[PDB]
Amino acid sequence: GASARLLRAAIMGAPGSGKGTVSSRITKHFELKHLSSGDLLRDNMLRGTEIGVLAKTFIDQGKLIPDDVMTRLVLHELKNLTQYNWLLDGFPRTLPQAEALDRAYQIDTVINLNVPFEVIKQRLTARWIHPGSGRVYNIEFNPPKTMGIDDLTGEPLVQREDDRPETVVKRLKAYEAQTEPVLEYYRKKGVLETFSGTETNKIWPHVYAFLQTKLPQRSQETSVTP
Ligand SMILES: Nc1ncnc2c1ncn2[C@@H]1O[C@H](COP(=O)(O)O)[C@@H](O)[C@H]1O
């Protein structure tokens, strides 16, 4: 369609930054292939491939899969997608992945969502479970009537170790350490576009207006016929 005009883009953002929502809306409104490296890894795992076994090992220890493995897997998929616009998501995560990618394809725009630390920390530590019933409470959307207590039984709620504040802080500092070199690398290339905000619905209009200058709105499903 857009003949020598295909978008090679990447989207970046901390866990809890709303990146997942913004990636959904981009794919809802524009004609592009969204390649998510976490989804490639889940599929390989689901299919029980050798990279699926390798990956599950690391992901269980919350580590990054080595750069060469991750780069090979992604580059193999992009080989197939050259005729489409694409949005890469979760890759590059490290500076060897970004340098490697640059030897194979020219990346035109990297979208970075910059949301304050405390906002991301509040999102990621918000979930509590009542173990007996499976009832979930999210402090932002449906808080219990008394904190740490199940509404219906009065029994205590618990939080997974992953959702605890200290664990979350640790994950965010690691993500920052990892991706800060990547952002600086795209910033020297002049391809980094940063969108800052505290709510995803205030950031989205700007990302939408920015990609509309770049690519084809998916033909017309106006579903809010309001
Ligand atoms: N670009 C990447 N490099 C290395 N590991 C990755 C990458 N993308 C996904 N993963 C991993 O898969 C896990 C979940 O990915 P994510 O869906 O992006 O949180 C991460 O903790 C890493 O173990």
PDB file of C-alpha atoms in Angstrom, residues 19-146:
ATOM      1  CA  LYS A  19       2.671   0.274  27.036  1.00  0.00           C
ATOM      2  CA  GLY A  20       0.343  -2.724  26.593  1.00  0.00           C
ATOM      3  CA  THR A  21      -2.730  -0.515  26.290  1.00  0.00           C
ATOM      4  CA  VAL A  22      -1.002   1.880  23.937  1.00  0.00           C
ATOM      5  CA  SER A  23       0.246  -0.981  21.734  1.00  0.00           C
ATOM      6  CA  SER A  24      -3.367  -2.362  21.590  1.00  0.00           C
ATOM      7  CA  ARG A  25      -4.776   1.000  20.521  1.00  0.00           C
ATOM      8  CA  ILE A  26      -2.043   1.437  17.800  1.00  0.00           C
ATOM      9  CA  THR A  27      -2.910  -1.925  16.364  1.00  0.00           C
ATOM     10  CA  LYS A  28      -6.634  -1.031  16.725  1.00  0.00           C
ATOM     11  CA  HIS A  29      -6.248   2.113  14.658  1.00  0.00           C
ATOM     12  CA  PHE A  30      -3.415   1.508  12.164  1.00  0.00           C
ATOM     13  CA  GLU A  31      -2.523  -1.049   9.624  1.00  0.00           C
ATOM     14  CA  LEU A  32       0.577  -2.717  11.073  1.00  0.00           C
ATOM     15  CA  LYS A  33       2.148  -5.917  12.458  1.00  0.00           C
ATOM     16  CA  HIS A  34       2.849  -5.845  16.071  1.00  0.00           C
ATOM     17  CA  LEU A  35       5.788  -8.154  17.013  1.00  0.00           C
ATOM     18  CA  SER A  36       6.056  -8.743  20.754  1.00  0.00           C
ATOM     19  CA  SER A  37       9.152 -10.581  21.945  1.00  0.00           C
ATOM     20  CA  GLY A  38       7.344 -11.768  25.174  1.00  0.00           C
ATOM     21  CA  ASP A  39       4.682 -13.295  22.835  1.00  0.00           C
ATOM     22  CA  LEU A  40       7.335 -15.100  20.722  1.00  0.00           C
ATOM     23  CA  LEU A  41       8.804 -16.536  23.870  1.00  0.00           C
ATOM     24  CA  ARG A  42       5.365 -17.631  25.159  1.00  0.00           C
ATOM     25  CA  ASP A  43       4.609 -19.342  21.852  1.00  0.00           C
ATOM     26  CA  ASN A  44       7.971 -21.169  21.783  1.00  0.00           C
ATOM     27  CA  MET A  45       7.362 -22.282  25.336  1.00  0.00           C
ATOM     28  CA  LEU A  46       3.772 -23.387  24.550  1.00  0.00           C
ATOM     29  CA  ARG A  47       5.117 -25.374  21.589  1.00  0.00           C
ATOM     30  CA  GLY A  48       7.963 -26.875  23.703  1.00  0.00           C
ATOM     31  CA  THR A  49      10.766 -25.900  21.382  1.00  0.00           C
ATOM     32  CA  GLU A  50      14.421 -25.868  22.638  1.00  0.00           C
ATOM     33  CA  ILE A  51      14.379 -22.085  22.849  1.00  0.00           C
ATOM     34  CA  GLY A  52      11.059 -22.596  24.780  1.00  0.00           C
ATOM     35  CA  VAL A  53      12.987 -24.712  27.365  1.00  0.00           C
ATOM     36  CA  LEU A  54      15.916 -22.288  27.514  1.00  0.00           C
ATOM     37  CA  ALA A  55      13.608 -19.308  27.894  1.00  0.00           C
ATOM     38  CA  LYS A  56      11.351 -20.836  30.647  1.00  0.00           C
ATOM     39  CA  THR A  57      14.556 -21.443  32.663  1.00  0.00           C
ATOM     40  CA  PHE A  58      15.489 -17.745  32.577  1.00  0.00           C
ATOM     41  CA  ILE A  59      12.038 -16.315  32.792  1.00  0.00           C
ATOM     42  CA  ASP A  60      11.499 -18.429  35.984  1.00  0.00           C
ATOM     43  CA  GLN A  61      14.554 -16.810  37.474  1.00  0.00           C
ATOM     44  CA  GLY A  62      13.193 -13.410  36.175  1.00  0.00           C
ATOM     45  CA  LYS A  63      16.289 -12.923  33.956  1.00  0.00           C
ATOM     46  CA  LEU A  64      16.646 -11.667  30.361  1.00  0.00           C
ATOM     47  CA  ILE A  65      17.172 -14.395  27.692  1.00  0.00           C
ATOM     48  CA  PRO A  66      20.772 -13.882  26.251  1.00  0.00           C
ATOM     49  CA  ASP A  67      21.067 -11.316  23.533  1.00  0.00           C
ATOM     50  CA  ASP A  68      22.141 -13.597  20.663  1.00  0.00           C
ATOM     51  CA  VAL A  69      19.224 -15.956  21.193  1.00  0.00           C
ATOM     52  CA  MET A  70      16.682 -13.201  21.455  1.00  0.00           C
ATOM     53  CA  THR A  71      18.198 -11.345  18.395  1.00  0.00           C
ATOM     54  CA  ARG A  72      18.138 -14.529  16.204  1.00  0.00           C
ATOM     55  CA  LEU A  73      14.587 -15.274  17.101  1.00  0.00           C
ATOM     56  CA  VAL A  74      13.421 -11.706  16.336  1.00  0.00           C
ATOM     57  CA  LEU A  75      15.415 -11.348  13.152  1.00  0.00           C
ATOM     58  CA  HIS A  76      14.058 -14.640  11.937  1.00  0.00           C
ATOM     59  CA  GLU A  77      10.504 -13.341  12.348  1.00  0.00           C
ATOM     60  CA  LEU A  78      11.214  -9.965  10.718  1.00  0.00           C
ATOM     61  CA  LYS A  79      12.457 -11.763   7.619  1.00  0.00           C
ATOM     62  CA  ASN A  80       8.867 -12.700   7.020  1.00  0.00           C
ATOM     63  CA  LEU A  81       7.411  -9.274   7.750  1.00  0.00           C
ATOM     64  CA  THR A  82       9.297  -6.989   5.384  1.00  0.00           C
ATOM     65  CA  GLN A  83       6.200  -6.223   3.339  1.00  0.00           C
ATOM     66  CA  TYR A  84       4.321  -4.775   6.326  1.00  0.00           C
ATOM     67  CA  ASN A  85       4.605  -1.845   8.614  1.00  0.00           C
ATOM     68  CA  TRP A  86       5.653  -3.120  12.054  1.00  0.00           C
ATOM     69  CA  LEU A  87       5.724  -2.131  15.704  1.00  0.00           C
ATOM     70  CA  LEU A  88       8.382  -4.040  17.708  1.00  0.00           C
ATOM     71  CA  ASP A  89       7.471  -4.374  21.403  1.00  0.00           C
ATOM     72  CA  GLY A  90       9.803  -5.574  24.124  1.00  0.00           C
ATOM     73  CA  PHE A  91      12.776  -5.794  21.664  1.00  0.00           C
ATOM     74  CA  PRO A  92      15.408  -4.183  21.774  1.00  0.00           C
ATOM     75  CA  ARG A  93      15.694  -4.456  25.499  1.00  0.00           C
ATOM     76  CA  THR A  94      19.456  -4.122  25.715  1.00  0.00           C
ATOM     77  CA  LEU A  95      22.075  -2.158  23.818  1.00  0.00           C
ATOM     78  CA  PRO A  96      23.576  -5.273  22.059  1.00  0.00           C
ATOM     79  CA  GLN A  97      19.998  -6.026  20.791  1.00  0.00           C
ATOM     80  CA  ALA A  98      19.594  -2.441  19.515  1.00  0.00           C
ATOM     81  CA  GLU A  99      23.062  -2.450  17.752  1.00  0.00           C
ATOM     82  CA  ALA A 100      22.346  -5.827  16.236  1.00  0.00           C
ATOM     83  CA  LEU A 101      18.976  -4.777  14.932  1.00  0.00           C
ATOM     84  CA  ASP A 102      20.619  -1.673  13.345  1.00  0.00           C
ATOM     85  CA  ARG A 103      22.892  -3.930  11.261  1.00  0.00           C
ATOM     86  CA  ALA A 104      19.844  -5.604   9.689  1.00  0.00           C
ATOM     87  CA  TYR A 105      17.055  -2.985   9.401  1.00  0.00           C
ATOM     88  CA  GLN A 106      16.818   0.787   9.608  1.00  0.00           C
ATOM     89  CA  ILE A 107      14.464   1.738  12.551  1.00  0.00           C
ATOM     90  CA  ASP A 108      12.639   4.935  11.821  1.00  0.00           C
ATOM     91  CA  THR A 109      10.887   5.827  15.122  1.00  0.00           C
ATOM     92  CA  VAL A 110      11.141   4.523  18.679  1.00  0.00           C
ATOM     93  CA  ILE A 111       8.210   5.554  20.932  1.00  0.00           C
ATOM     94  CA  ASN A 112       9.096   5.816  24.576  1.00  0.00           C
ATOM     95  CA  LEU A 113       6.389   6.226  27.255  1.00  0.00           C
ATOM     96  CA  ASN A 114       7.819   8.020  30.267  1.00  0.00           C
ATOM     97  CA  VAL A 115       5.506   7.672  33.311  1.00  0.00           C
ATOM     98  CA  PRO A 116       6.712   8.757  36.867  1.00  0.00           C
ATOM     99  CA  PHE A 117       8.214   6.017  39.077  1.00  0.00           C
ATOM    100  CA  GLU A 118       5.704   6.368  41.890  1.00  0.00           C
ATOM    101  CA  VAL A 119       2.758   5.957  39.439  1.00  0.00           C
ATOM    102  CA  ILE A 120       4.260   2.786  37.980  1.00  0.00           C
ATOM    103  CA  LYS A 121       5.057   1.503  41.459  1.00  0.00           C
ATOM    104  CA  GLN A 122       1.425   2.097  42.591  1.00  0.00           C
ATOM    105  CA  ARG A 123       0.062   0.154  39.592  1.00  0.00           C
ATOM    106  CA  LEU A 124       2.304  -2.838  40.030  1.00  0.00           C
ATOM    107  CA  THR A 125       1.786  -3.281  43.803  1.00  0.00           C
ATOM    108  CA  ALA A 126      -2.017  -2.782  43.709  1.00  0.00           C
ATOM    109  CA  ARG A 127      -3.195  -6.421  43.596  1.00  0.00           C
ATOM    110  CA  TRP A 128      -4.337  -8.438  46.615  1.00  0.00           C
ATOM    111  CA  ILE A 129      -5.994 -11.903  46.614  1.00  0.00           C
ATOM    112  CA  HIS A 130      -8.358 -13.609  49.054  1.00  0.00           C
ATOM    113  CA  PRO A 131      -6.685 -17.109  48.934  1.00  0.00           C
ATOM    114  CA  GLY A 132      -9.800 -19.072  49.780  1.00  0.00           C
ATOM    115  CA  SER A 133     -12.118 -17.807  47.033  1.00  0.00           C
ATOM    116  CA  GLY A 134      -9.698 -16.453  44.427  1.00  0.00           C
ATOM    117  CA  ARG A 135     -11.283 -12.941  44.856  1.00  0.00           C
ATOM    118  CA  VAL A 136      -8.982 -10.260  43.507  1.00  0.00           C
ATOM    119  CA  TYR A 137      -8.958  -6.649  44.844  1.00  0.00           C
ATOM    120  CA  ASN A 138      -6.983  -3.981  43.079  1.00  0.00           C
ATOM    121  CA  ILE A 139      -6.273  -0.966  45.176  1.00  0.00           C
ATOM    122  CA  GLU A 140      -6.798   1.363  42.192  1.00  0.00           C
ATOM    123  CA  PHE A 141     -10.089  -0.075  40.830  1.00  0.00           C
ATOM    124  CA  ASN A 142     -11.906  -2.065  43.527  1.00  0.00           C
ATOM    125  CA  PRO A 143     -10.214  -1.595  46.947  1.00  0.00           C
ATOM    126  CA  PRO A 144     -11.589  -3.699  49.870  1.00  0.00           C
ATOM    127  CA  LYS A 145     -13.757  -1.857  52.390  1.00  0.00           C
ATOM    128  CA  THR A 146     -11.062  -2.531  55.084  1.00  0.00           C
TER     129      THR A 146
END
